[PDB]
C-alpha cells in the first residue's frame, strides 16, 4: 500500500500546474524514498524531472515500488478542487488501477475524496548524468519569467549568453530584436532578488522560448530559479520545492 | 535548430 | 402608477446578474405589497421566484396590480449604467409600454434617464407550502465552490443528506468525487455554520449546470438554504438583506 | 541622429494604448521641435493627431527629420515591457531602418534594448485652427463612462450643448437613454466640473464606436475638451499636460 | 431529466 500525508497541499497543486501544460501523460515513480517523475514532451525537445522526498511529508508509507501512469490534465482538474491550505493525502493499493486523493480542510468539517483512474504506460526512461556546468546563474523567479514572456513577443528563440559581468537574453523576429541584461547584483543584506553568477568560460546558446515559458509555470514554487548552461549541453532550469525536493527542466538547444 | 532531448541522453 | 426609490442600488444590480444568465424575459407583478417575479428557463427544468417587499425600498407607490414584462439582460445593462452612490428611481404608468429608470447622483451634477421598452407575456406555477425532509443552511461561498468543483468532475450531483451532514457526489470520465460537509458545532458567527434539519434521510440527483446558474446569486447572501425531499424538486433559497428572497427550484434527475 | 530620454515612461505607454486600437501603421515625424503623428483609422473616418514637444522630454536631440513608419501594436507590446520607474530612451539614425527603445532600471541592474523594424507608408491633411460653437471641458472619466454606458443602448450618441448643460442621448430597440451634465452648483470652489463656452446651441450625432476608441486616452488627462459645431467635425482633445496633446477628430451626421 | 411540470400546476 501507498499512503502519503502532505499538509502543505498548495505545493502539489503548484507542482501539477507546472506539469499539466508541458507533459500530457506521465509516470509517477513511488518508492521508499519518495515520488520521482521523469518525462519528455510530445516532441522530445524538453524533459521534466520532479523529486519529492519522503522527508517532506507528514506521513509517508510505501510498501512496493509503485509505477502510476497518470494523465496530468485529469489530475490538474481534480487538484483544482483543492484549497491552497488543504491537507492532501494520496493513497493507492499495490494492485490498484486508481489513485485516491483526500483533501482535508484545516479540520473545517469538510472532506473531499476523489478517485482518479490510472493507466498502463510503456515509458522511455532517460539517463541524466550529474555534470558541472560552465555558467550557473541564480536569479529571481519573477525576473526570469518576465524576460521569457517579454522576449516571446519579439521572436520564438532566445540566445542566452552568460559571462562574468552578467547574463544577457537576446531574441530576433520579423519585427526586430530584444536584449535584456541582468547584472551580478551584490545585495549585501537581501538574499533573494539577487543575480549571482558562477562562470568557468562564457557560454552562448540558443533555446526555444515556448518551452521556457512552459517551464516558467513553476514560478510559484520558488522565489529563486537556477539556470545551468554548458556549451553543447542542455539547459537546466531548477526550482527548489521548499526543502523537500526539486523540479528540474531540461531543454535541448538550437543548432 | 531544433535538437530532440535525445542526441544527449539514453 | 408605480414609483419606487431605492438607495441601495447595488442590491438590484446583483439580483439581475443572478437572473440575467438563467432567464431572458420575466413578468414582474408589482402590487401594494411589493414586487414578485416567477418564471422558468427556456428548458422548463428550473424556476426562479423573486420577492422584494415594499418595506425594503426608500419610497414605494403601487395602486393596481401591474404586470410588466421586461427583458432582464436589457435591464441589467441599463442598471450597470448606474453609479455606485447614485439614488435609483423606477417609475411606470398604468397603461405604459415603457419603464423609466432615473439614476440621480448626489448634489445633482449628473442625472441619467433611461426608458426601457416593455412587452406582453407568462406562466406561473403554484408551489404549495410544504414540509421538506432535509433542510441544510450553509455558507453561500462554500456551496458555490462545491458546485463549480464537482462541475469539473461530472455534470450531475448526488446530494445525500443525513442528521450528521451532507455529502455531494459526482462521477465522470476522469474519476469520482465525494465532498462531505459536517454539521458545525461551536461556530461563532452564525453566517458560517452548516445546520441540518432532518425528518428522513434524503438522496437526490440534480443537474450541475442549473446549480451553477443558481450560484450567481451568491454575492446577495452569505448563507444559502437547500431544501430537499425525495421525488420533489430542490429549493435553493438565498435571503436578500432584509428586503426579500430569491428562490431557485430544480427538478431532480430520473 | 535622433535620441530622446524620457523619465516619465508611463506617458508613452498610455499614448500607445490610446492609439494602437485605432490606427495600425503610423508615420512619426521627428524633428528638432519634437514628435508629430497625424493619421486616419483603418476605415479613414476619424483622425488622430499626437504632438509631443521636445521641451517635455528629459533629453532631446534631433539632427535630420525622421519619418518612421511603425506598427503601433508592436510598439505597444515593446512598451508593456517597461517598468513604471524605468527611464525610456528612443534612438534612430538619419538613414536608419530601425527604432531603438532602451528601458533603463533605476539602479542600473537591468537594461532592456529593443530594436523595432520600421517601414514605408504613404499619407496628413491640414486642420487649421477654427472657432467652434460649443467648447465643454469636463472630467475625462465621466465622459468615458458616458460613452461606454450609452454604447449599450445604441451605436450613435446625440450630444446637445446649451446654457443649462450638455446632454448625451441614445436610442435602440431596447429603449433610450439621456444623460445630462449641468454646470457647477455647490460653491465656486469647483472651477473644474463641466465648464461650457457656448456661441450657439448645438445638437450633433456622432458614432459611439469611435468615441470609445478615443476614450482610451483617459489615463493621460483628468479632463477632456469637446469642441462642436454643426456640420463641422467634433474635436475630442486630451491634453498631455506636461508634454503636448492628443486630438481625435470625428465627423458627424451618419 | 424531470421537467418542473410533471409538477406544479
PDB file of N, CA and C in Angstrom, chain D residues 172-205:
ATOM      1  N   UNK D 172     -32.231  52.753 -29.025  1.00  0.00           N
ATOM      2  CA  UNK D 172     -32.158  51.460 -29.674  1.00  0.00           C
ATOM      3  C   UNK D 172     -33.436  50.675 -29.443  1.00  0.00           C
ATOM      4  N   UNK D 173     -33.494  49.462 -30.021  1.00  0.00           N
ATOM      5  CA  UNK D 173     -34.645  48.570 -29.839  1.00  0.00           C
ATOM      6  C   UNK D 173     -35.039  48.365 -28.386  1.00  0.00           C
ATOM      7  N   UNK D 174     -34.124  48.557 -27.442  1.00  0.00           N
ATOM      8  CA  UNK D 174     -34.450  48.294 -26.048  1.00  0.00           C
ATOM      9  C   UNK D 174     -34.786  49.558 -25.272  1.00  0.00           C
ATOM     10  N   UNK D 175     -34.853  50.705 -25.938  1.00  0.00           N
ATOM     11  CA  UNK D 175     -35.252  51.917 -25.254  1.00  0.00           C
ATOM     12  C   UNK D 175     -34.423  53.127 -25.625  1.00  0.00           C
ATOM     13  N   UNK D 176     -34.272  54.059 -24.688  1.00  0.00           N
ATOM     14  CA  UNK D 176     -33.487  55.257 -24.941  1.00  0.00           C
ATOM     15  C   UNK D 176     -32.874  55.731 -23.631  1.00  0.00           C
ATOM     16  N   UNK D 177     -31.723  56.379 -23.742  1.00  0.00           N
ATOM     17  CA  UNK D 177     -31.034  56.913 -22.586  1.00  0.00           C
ATOM     18  C   UNK D 177     -30.645  58.360 -22.801  1.00  0.00           C
ATOM     19  N   UNK D 178     -30.642  59.114 -21.700  1.00  0.00           N
ATOM     20  CA  UNK D 178     -30.373  60.550 -21.761  1.00  0.00           C
ATOM     21  C   UNK D 178     -29.628  60.957 -20.491  1.00  0.00           C
ATOM     22  N   UNK D 179     -28.319  61.130 -20.610  1.00  0.00           N
ATOM     23  CA  UNK D 179     -27.507  61.643 -19.513  1.00  0.00           C
ATOM     24  C   UNK D 179     -27.390  63.149 -19.672  1.00  0.00           C
ATOM     25  N   UNK D 180     -27.478  63.871 -18.558  1.00  0.00           N
ATOM     26  CA  UNK D 180     -27.475  65.327 -18.573  1.00  0.00           C
ATOM     27  C   UNK D 180     -26.464  65.825 -17.553  1.00  0.00           C
ATOM     28  N   UNK D 181     -25.466  66.567 -18.022  1.00  0.00           N
ATOM     29  CA  UNK D 181     -24.449  67.152 -17.162  1.00  0.00           C
ATOM     30  C   UNK D 181     -24.727  68.645 -17.064  1.00  0.00           C
ATOM     31  N   UNK D 182     -24.903  69.125 -15.840  1.00  0.00           N
ATOM     32  CA  UNK D 182     -25.251  70.503 -15.539  1.00  0.00           C
ATOM     33  C   UNK D 182     -24.027  71.258 -15.044  1.00  0.00           C
ATOM     34  N   UNK D 183     -24.073  72.578 -15.189  1.00  0.00           N
ATOM     35  CA  UNK D 183     -22.955  73.393 -14.751  1.00  0.00           C
ATOM     36  C   UNK D 183     -22.783  73.264 -13.237  1.00  0.00           C
ATOM     37  N   UNK D 184     -21.654  73.772 -12.748  1.00  0.00           N
ATOM     38  CA  UNK D 184     -21.289  73.576 -11.352  1.00  0.00           C
ATOM     39  C   UNK D 184     -22.244  74.316 -10.427  1.00  0.00           C
ATOM     40  N   UNK D 185     -22.686  73.621  -9.386  1.00  0.00           N
ATOM     41  CA  UNK D 185     -23.509  74.196  -8.327  1.00  0.00           C
ATOM     42  C   UNK D 185     -22.658  74.293  -7.048  1.00  0.00           C
ATOM     43  N   UNK D 186     -23.090  73.746  -5.913  1.00  0.00           N
ATOM     44  CA  UNK D 186     -22.297  73.841  -4.688  1.00  0.00           C
ATOM     45  C   UNK D 186     -21.715  75.231  -4.443  1.00  0.00           C
ATOM     46  N   UNK D 187     -20.387  75.332  -4.378  1.00  0.00           N
ATOM     47  CA  UNK D 187     -19.707  76.610  -4.208  1.00  0.00           C
ATOM     48  C   UNK D 187     -18.807  76.867  -5.417  1.00  0.00           C
ATOM     49  N   UNK D 188     -18.211  78.063  -5.454  1.00  0.00           N
ATOM     50  CA  UNK D 188     -17.291  78.403  -6.535  1.00  0.00           C
ATOM     51  C   UNK D 188     -15.884  77.929  -6.203  1.00  0.00           C
ATOM     52  N   UNK D 189     -15.781  76.876  -5.395  1.00  0.00           N
ATOM     53  CA  UNK D 189     -14.527  76.161  -5.201  1.00  0.00           C
ATOM     54  C   UNK D 189     -14.426  74.962  -6.134  1.00  0.00           C
ATOM     55  N   UNK D 190     -15.146  75.011  -7.262  1.00  0.00           N
ATOM     56  CA  UNK D 190     -15.130  73.975  -8.278  1.00  0.00           C
ATOM     57  C   UNK D 190     -15.022  74.661  -9.644  1.00  0.00           C
ATOM     58  N   UNK D 191     -13.805  75.100  -9.983  1.00  0.00           N
ATOM     59  CA  UNK D 191     -13.564  75.642 -11.317  1.00  0.00           C
ATOM     60  C   UNK D 191     -13.663  74.546 -12.362  1.00  0.00           C
ATOM     61  N   UNK D 192     -13.331  73.322 -11.974  1.00  0.00           N
ATOM     62  CA  UNK D 192     -13.166  72.203 -12.889  1.00  0.00           C
ATOM     63  C   UNK D 192     -14.249  71.156 -12.645  1.00  0.00           C
ATOM     64  N   UNK D 193     -15.433  71.430 -13.183  1.00  0.00           N
ATOM     65  CA  UNK D 193     -16.513  70.457 -13.229  1.00  0.00           C
ATOM     66  C   UNK D 193     -16.812  70.255 -14.705  1.00  0.00           C
ATOM     67  N   UNK D 194     -17.913  70.822 -15.185  1.00  0.00           N
ATOM     68  CA  UNK D 194     -18.218  70.878 -16.611  1.00  0.00           C
ATOM     69  C   UNK D 194     -18.307  72.355 -16.961  1.00  0.00           C
ATOM     70  N   UNK D 195     -17.256  72.898 -17.571  1.00  0.00           N
ATOM     71  CA  UNK D 195     -17.244  74.301 -17.965  1.00  0.00           C
ATOM     72  C   UNK D 195     -17.617  74.376 -19.433  1.00  0.00           C
ATOM     73  N   UNK D 196     -18.582  75.226 -19.752  1.00  0.00           N
ATOM     74  CA  UNK D 196     -19.079  75.353 -21.112  1.00  0.00           C
ATOM     75  C   UNK D 196     -18.806  76.757 -21.618  1.00  0.00           C
ATOM     76  N   UNK D 197     -18.363  76.847 -22.864  1.00  0.00           N
ATOM     77  CA  UNK D 197     -18.266  78.112 -23.581  1.00  0.00           C
ATOM     78  C   UNK D 197     -19.129  77.954 -24.822  1.00  0.00           C
ATOM     79  N   UNK D 198     -20.274  78.629 -24.833  1.00  0.00           N
ATOM     80  CA  UNK D 198     -21.262  78.459 -25.885  1.00  0.00           C
ATOM     81  C   UNK D 198     -21.332  79.704 -26.755  1.00  0.00           C
ATOM     82  N   UNK D 199     -21.538  79.479 -28.045  1.00  0.00           N
ATOM     83  CA  UNK D 199     -21.822  80.520 -29.020  1.00  0.00           C
ATOM     84  C   UNK D 199     -23.189  80.369 -29.661  1.00  0.00           C
ATOM     85  N   UNK D 200     -23.662  79.140 -29.829  1.00  0.00           N
ATOM     86  CA  UNK D 200     -24.941  78.818 -30.439  1.00  0.00           C
ATOM     87  C   UNK D 200     -25.307  77.388 -30.060  1.00  0.00           C
ATOM     88  N   UNK D 201     -26.538  77.133 -29.619  1.00  0.00           N
ATOM     89  CA  UNK D 201     -26.895  75.780 -29.179  1.00  0.00           C
ATOM     90  C   UNK D 201     -26.513  74.752 -30.234  1.00  0.00           C
ATOM     91  N   UNK D 202     -26.105  73.570 -29.779  1.00  0.00           N
ATOM     92  CA  UNK D 202     -25.625  72.548 -30.699  1.00  0.00           C
ATOM     93  C   UNK D 202     -26.346  71.239 -30.423  1.00  0.00           C
ATOM     94  N   UNK D 203     -26.594  70.477 -31.490  1.00  0.00           N
ATOM     95  CA  UNK D 203     -27.211  69.158 -31.377  1.00  0.00           C
ATOM     96  C   UNK D 203     -26.665  68.318 -32.530  1.00  0.00           C
ATOM     97  N   UNK D 204     -25.658  67.497 -32.240  1.00  0.00           N
ATOM     98  CA  UNK D 204     -24.962  66.719 -33.254  1.00  0.00           C
ATOM     99  C   UNK D 204     -25.020  65.233 -32.930  1.00  0.00           C
ATOM    100  N   UNK D 205     -24.883  64.418 -33.973  1.00  0.00           N
ATOM    101  CA  UNK D 205     -24.904  62.965 -33.859  1.00  0.00           C
ATOM    102  C   UNK D 205     -23.533  62.409 -34.220  1.00  0.00           C
TER     103      UNK D 205
END
